[PDB]
Amino acid sequence: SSYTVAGRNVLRWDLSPEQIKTRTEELIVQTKQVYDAVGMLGIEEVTYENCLQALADVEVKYIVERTMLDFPQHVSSDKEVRAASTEADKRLSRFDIEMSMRGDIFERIVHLQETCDLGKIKPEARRYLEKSIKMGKRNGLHLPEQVQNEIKSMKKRMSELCIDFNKNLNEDDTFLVFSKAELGALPDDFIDSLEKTDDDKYKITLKYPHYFPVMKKCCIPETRRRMEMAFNTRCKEENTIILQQLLPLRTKVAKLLGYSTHADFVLEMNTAKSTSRVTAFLDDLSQKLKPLGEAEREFILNLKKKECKDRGFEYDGKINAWDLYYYMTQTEELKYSIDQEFLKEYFPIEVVTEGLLNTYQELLGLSFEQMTDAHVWNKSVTLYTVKDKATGEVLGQFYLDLYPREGKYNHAACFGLQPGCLLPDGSRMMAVAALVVNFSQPVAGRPSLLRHDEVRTYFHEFGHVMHQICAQTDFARFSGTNVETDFVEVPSQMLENWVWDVDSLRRLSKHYKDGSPIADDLLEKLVASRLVNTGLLTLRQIVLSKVDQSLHTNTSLDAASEYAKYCSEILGVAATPGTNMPATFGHLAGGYDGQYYGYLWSEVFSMDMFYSCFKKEGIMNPEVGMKYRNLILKPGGSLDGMDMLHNFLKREPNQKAFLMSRGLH
């Protein structure tokens, strides 16, 4: 039922490695029979019920059953389950290609669109037709025979290379051993939480709760250099081989389909349309950030010469790759009076979560409640039930995996587990999401305290959770976050602005020992810090965007030398010789290939929707929040990205609100 919750979450997390392999073969057969039934009937026998409805009913069933088989490889504690899920992901991905390269299924969908009154079906039904044909031509189904077999062969290999790429980063275990003297300036709550070796030294892992506190606080230059070295060389050998094959395969398949480069192939399905507009967006943006880059690079260098003068270290006169995070922290302390290790005392994990949910149990008109003794994949996971406040409709559920562990996803992303589309019986399926992050853990008898950037990530990933739950469509391929990948970061980055409001932070803040809020003048200092180090922070994001474009537009280039090229040309900090950053760039194998510009591209839209609608009429106003939930989150992929922006802004977006929020023209 649309108002109950019992029986709507069909996901089981107690699968064994044998059960995972068994279900993979069963899901392939039971889906092969559906595609064979549609592909076997005559072309003159196709209808909306036996062709379009038959495929639509199997896509929703497949993607839900697929979730239980390709998600344990990201959150499980058993490496055999993580191995069985990774092998099941490689098998189901090749099955997706064999079912998409069908000439029989393609010949009937194109004939169905012609011999059918399009004005009689719902507008999303005909969009399902034109997008299926568009997705078929992007597979070369209108090309001659042996050309399709060569495309299908290279797509299968690209599938296995991308899965092995992230599998290497997920299963990495390289650590470093440091002594107490080599971990200078690090607080004692961080050092007393490390595994101690036989030589009375400490062990440091490369996860975020360990790498960042070392690169921001440790005053020993040799410690920060060896940490940055091991972090930017993870899987340097095995992934460079994968990159030397994945990139040429994308070029050969993009030109077989008629496109110039692989960047041009993926850009026409995004809001930016063309690659010439992306390079113009990145070059003109780094043009305005260039004066800010020179000013911030000069202050950091002067900040380094004085510390080397005081501590007695040798001064090389350059800003190395390991000196960046260390002195950007000092710029935040000196120019804005912000102590990250003291600010986290007012942000315990439960107070942030309680305030984060209450912020959206009022803005979006939702009703959150936690489930007790929920069926989860790990004891650290909690389940919540999302309900509409007025109608009581059970919209969906979401999990919370907030702590790092062995074999867990190293970064911080959101996973859409169940879509919010229609079932074959006509009922609406309850949507399920999952927030996976690696926040700090409770140490020294204190609750899990979060830095302000950890709260910014908490609000960011929760945007994808809300975009997943509130999305209600009819087809599975248009539900959830299935929008333009350069537009999917609009709902997430839109909610980061609530971490920069003084009244919103006052609700998210409570000291972990006496419950006293943050000082009034200190809230002003924290809000005023939203543009500290904005030059170098954004320039480094432009470098990643240019490398993402360069590796997919120009052929025959070393990814390591191309990343180092754009470093000294844009950011100003030289890449350490030997460190292969693209070998660790997980976005190049996680659907963000050739589309990494979408982060800065989506920020122009979120800033325009926040300053022109939310901030103008109160950021907590539910009338504006209801427009945002119905025109941005609810349509999902059933509408175009620019269509949802024109319906919400009632005009055309621009960089007006985006530029003045960064301190530019």
Partner: peptide, 6 residues
């Protein structure tokens, strides 16, 4: 989904 590499 996903997030920029910090």
């Amino acid at each position: 989904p996903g997030f920029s590499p910090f």
